[PDB]
């Protein structure tokens, strides 16, 4: 007996250094409905309703700005004013009503043409989302 | 066909500098049931049950302490020790069981009578909450 | 009528200084089904399904690494790079599918043998989780 379900939880373990593009998380904690696509780093709404989104990422670059995108524009914009060195750790959560076809993803902005020396890492960056409430009916 | 639903997600983009008062988030990501009131900055429970709350805010002041209030007292107290440059970015999440009429809001405390020069900003601070489980019945 | 429900939200206020062991949160914001055991500091899955987990903790030690465990292995590994003052404030969220018997808990690692002088504190660290989707049936 079918139930309107949609959720995904994905990570990176590190590498976030490319700006202006959708961050493509490939570590899958959960993506049963395959509504999230690691090839594009985008979540595709296949069920209209209220979704909850949450992310915790580590960005390796200077003056980092994080944007959570819905459809084609930034709906959430993070600019941690407490950025030290060339590493930024941003997080956020929000509820977004989505229609079928609506896309949601994360994107970073900043300078990485002058990054110091890397390190061990093994630090999980995550992007999660799930359908809270299915629309009308 | 009615369903016990209650959720809200609101932000500010910036303005939080006044302490001791409910932070009035006015940017509405979601507030369909209008259980959140931007005039008071408080969420009003209209359905008894278990609620999840989550916030990510940036506070412009020193020696900042953040409190999530339920009814009339702080249930969550955040005093990040990682403060420096008079810019505190506190976050938190918790599950609270609420009864009809219970109010929930965020409140900050600190010294804002010696803040340096501002900046571009454009940094979303958010307050989100949703009914997870409706009570008994 | 029975509803497959399972959620918990617990905190500490301060203490986390001992590494390698499951953090025992004892402040109960919610633990109605008693699925979280404050004695062992572990959540026990009593209902198979999709769970959302969220945590915001403050660790008092140096070179702090944080791990969210599922059953016996670390699922999430948080190694905040912007650490200082021997105080690490880590947070994370993720969705995990669990089977009955599966245990989930938080554990920290790091050097706490030589920490500086404490302070007021009163800083709520939290560990929360809830069943999102009950399994098949």
Sorted by where each begins, the domain ranges of chain C are: 1-137
**Whole-number Å distance between alpha carbons of B108 and C84:** 24
**Whole-number Å distance between alpha carbons of B38 and B122:** 20
Chains in contact with A, counting 3 or more C-beta pairs less than 8 Å apart as contact: B, C
Chains in contact with C, counting 3 or more C-beta pairs less than 8 Å apart as contact: A, B
Name the experimental technique: X-ray
A39's CB contacts (< 8 A; 6+ apart) are: A24
**Whole-number Å distance between alpha carbons of A114 and C42:** 43
Identify the DSSP state of B132.
Answer: E
**Whole-number Å distance between alpha carbons of C56 and B90:** 10
Q: Which residues of A touch C50 (CB under 8 A)?
A: 7, 30, 32, 130
**Whole-number Å distance between alpha carbons of C131 and B53:** 15
A127's CB contacts (< 8 A; 6+ apart) are: A8, A9, A10, A11, A23, A25, A53, A54, A55, A57, A106
Residues in chain A: 137
Optimal mutation site among A93, A98, A106, interface B, most CBs of chain B within 10 A = A93
Resolution of this model in Å is 2.1
CATH 2.60.120.40 fits C1-137, yes or no: yes
The chain B residue lying nearest A68, using CA atoms, is: B124
Interface of C with B in 97-116 (CB under 8 A): none
Contact at CB, C82 and A89, closer than 8 angstroms? yes
Chain centre to alpha carbon of residue C11: 9
A78's CB contacts (< 8 A; 6+ apart) are: A65, A66, A67, A68, A90, A91, A92, B123, B124
Distances (CA, A) of C101 to B16, C44, C98, C132: 45, 6, 8, 17
* Of residues B79, B82, B97, nearest to C30 (C-beta): B97
CA torsion sign, C78 to C79 to C82 to C84? positive
Identify the DSSP state of C85.
Answer: T
Optimal mutation site among C78, C88, C91, C97, interface A, most CBs of chain A within 10 A = C78
Interface of B with C in 13-52 (CB under 8 A): 50, 52
**Whole-number Å distance between alpha carbons of C2 and B133:** 13
Contact at CB, B79 and C120, closer than 8 angstroms? yes
Contact at CB, B94 and C9, closer than 8 angstroms? yes
C48's CB contacts (< 8 A; 6+ apart) are: C97, C98, C99, C100, C134, C135
* B120 Cβ under 8 Å from any chain A Cβ: yes
* Residue reference for tokens 């920290």: C108
Distances (CA, A) of B50 to A75, B5, B134, C69, C105: 27, 12, 7, 25, 22
* Of residues B52, B75, B76, nearest to C130 (C-beta): B52
Q: How big is the B-C interface in CB pairs under 8 Å? A: 66
**Whole-number Å distance between alpha carbons of A27 and C121:** 36
* A119 Cβ under 8 Å from any chain C Cβ: yes
* Of residues A29, A122, A128, nearest to C79 (C-beta): A122
Q: Which residues of A touch C95 (CB under 8 A)?
A: 7-9, 29-30, 128, 130
Contact at CB, C30 and B95, closer than 8 angstroms? yes
Distances (CA, A) of C56 to A101, B55, C48: 33, 11, 25
**What token pair was written down for C124?**
């709520």
* Residue reference for tokens 């609506």: A102
Interior CA angle at C128 toward C29 and B42, to 5°?
A: 60
A45's CB contacts (< 8 A; 6+ apart) are: A6, A35, A51, A98, A99, A100, A101, A102, A103, A104
**Whole-number Å distance between alpha carbons of A87 and B25:** 29
**Whole-number Å distance between alpha carbons of B93 and C11:** 11
The chain A residue lying nearest C80, using CA atoms, is: A123
Phi and psi of A101, rounded to 5°?
A: 95, -25
Contact at CB, A9 and C94, closer than 8 angstroms? yes
**What token pair was written down for A127?**
């992007």
A42 bridge partner residues: A37
- CA contacts within 13 A on the Cβ side of B59: 30
Strand order in the sheet with C27-30: C27-30, C7-11, C126-134, C49-60, C87-98
Show the DSSP H helices in chain C as ranges. Answer: none
Contact at CB, A124 and C92, closer than 8 angstroms? yes
Interface of C with A in 57-86 (CB under 8 A): 75-82
Q: Which residues of B touch A80 (CB under 8 A)?
A: 58, 89, 123
Contact C123, B80 (CB under 8 A): yes
C112's CB contacts (< 8 A; 6+ apart) are: C17, C18, C19, C60, C61, C62, C86
């Amino acid at each position: 007996a079918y139930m309107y379900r949609s959720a995904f939880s994905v990570g990176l373990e590190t590498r976030v250094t490319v700006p202006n593009v959708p961050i493509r998380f490939t570590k899958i904690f959960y993506n049963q409905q395959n509504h999230y696509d690691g090839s594009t780093g985008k979540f595709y709404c296949n069920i209209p309703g209220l979704y909850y989104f949450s992310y915790h990422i580590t960005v390796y670059m200077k003056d980092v700005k994080v944007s959570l995108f819905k459809k084609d524009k930034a709906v959430l914009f993070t600019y941690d004013q407490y950025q030290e060195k060339n590493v930024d750790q941003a997080s956020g959560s929000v509820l977004l009503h989505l229609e079928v076809g609506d896309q949601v993803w994360l994107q970073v902005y900043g300078d990485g043409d002058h990054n110091g020396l890397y390190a061990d890492n093994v630090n999980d960056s995550t992007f999660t989302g799930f359908l809270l409430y299915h629309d009308t009916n």
